[PDB]
Design a protein around this ligand. Structure first.
Ligand SMILES: [Cl-]
Ligand SMILES: [Cl-]
Ligand SMILES: [Cl-]
Ligand SMILES: [Cs+]
Ligand SMILES: [K+]
Length: 115
């Protein structure tokens, strides 16, 4: 009856959000996905609770851009026809963009399944 939690380290990935360079990571409690614009010393501009994330999608390998797209639960007063909130992070590490995207994706999918 053993219980295991994930033990990989939390990555800090070079990513662009709405055409600004920054760092995508998770909070230490692994409850929030946070993006902070460079220099990365101010507060996050995107903070998405993992409990509110309903989907994770990626550009397929070989695409022009390496992007992860996260979808959130609809906001409380959203109109029923409206698309759900979404957040696209382009991975910009010149050699490691796809590997960094895969690392975050894998860590996120584990946490999302564990909750
Ligand atoms: Cl933290
Ligand atoms: Cl940094
Ligand atoms: Cl790729
Ligand atoms: Cs990294
Ligand atoms: K590009």
């Amino acid at each position: 009856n053993l219980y295991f939690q994930g033990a990989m380290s939390i990555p800090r990935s070079q990513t662009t959000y709405k055409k600004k360079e920054g760092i995508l990571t998770l909070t230490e409690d692994r409850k929030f996905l946070i993006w902070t614009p460079l220099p990365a010393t101010g507060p996050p501009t995107v903070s998405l609770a993992l409990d509110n994330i309903t989907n994770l999608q990626q550009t397929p390998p070989g695409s022009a851009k390496v992007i992860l797209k996260f979808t959130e639960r609809p906001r409380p007063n959203a109109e029923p026809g409206a698309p759900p909130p979404q957040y696209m992070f382009q991975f910009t590490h010149p050699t490691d963009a796809r590997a960094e995207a895969n690392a975050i994706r894998d860590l996120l999918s584990q946490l999302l399944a564990a909750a």
